[PDB]
């Protein structure tokens, strides 16, 4: 990991999270 | 005159006189839970 993830190299976590991403009555 | 969501539910309505549209948000609701230790320790509770 990377605490704020400021590196140009993205962890596999971000790729998988974005890949998964891609009533009150 | 009306608006509907994907669930075929009324969402917005237009004012008949001043032809403006108003969003319909339902009143809040939810369950109530009671937090407590064992009665043999105290009788204090906290609700959520
Ligand atoms: C609570 O404690 C009393 C004695 O201290 C005992 O008689 C009773 O069975 C206990 N009840 C529970 C639910 O622990």
Written description of the protein model:
The structure is cut from a larger assembly and holds two copies of chain A. Chain A has 25 residues and is mainly alpha-helical. In chain A, 40% of the residues lie in helices and 0% in strands. Chain A has one helix and no strands. Chain A is elongated. In chain A, 0% of the residues are buried. Chain A: This is Spike protein S2. Chain A: It comes from Severe acute respiratory syndrome coronavirus 2 (2019-nCoV).
Radius of gyration of chain A: 14 Å
- List the bound ligands: 2-acetamido-2-deoxy-beta-D-glucopyranose
Which two protein chains have the largest interface (Cβ within 8 Å of the partner's Cβ), and how many residues from each?
A-B, 3 and 7 residues
Q: Note the gap between the termini of chain A.
A: 41 Å
N-to-C order of helices and strands of chain A: H
What structural class should be given to the helix and strand makeup of chain A? mainly alpha
Judging from the principal axes of the Cα atoms, what is the shape of chain A? elongated
The assembly state of the depicted protein chains is: part of a larger assembly
Portion of residues in beta strands of chain A equals under 5%
Report the count of strand segments of chain A. 0
Number of helices of chain A: 1
Largest sheet of chain A: none
The helical percent of chain A reads: 40-55%
Brief characterization of the structure:
Chain B: Glycans are attached at residue 40. This is part of a larger assembly, with two copies of chain A. Chain A has 25 residues and is mainly alpha-helical.
């Amino acid at each position: 990991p990377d605490p704020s993830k400021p590196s140009k190299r993205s962890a596999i976590e971000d790729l998988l999270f974005n890949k998964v991403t891609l009533q009150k009555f | 005159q009306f608006g509907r969501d994907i669930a075929d539910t009324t969402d917005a309505v237009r004012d008949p006189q001043t032809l403006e549209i108003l969003d319909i948000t339902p009143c809040s609701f939810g369950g109530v839970s009671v937090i407590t230790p064992g009665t043999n320790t105290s009788n204090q509770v906290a609700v959520l």
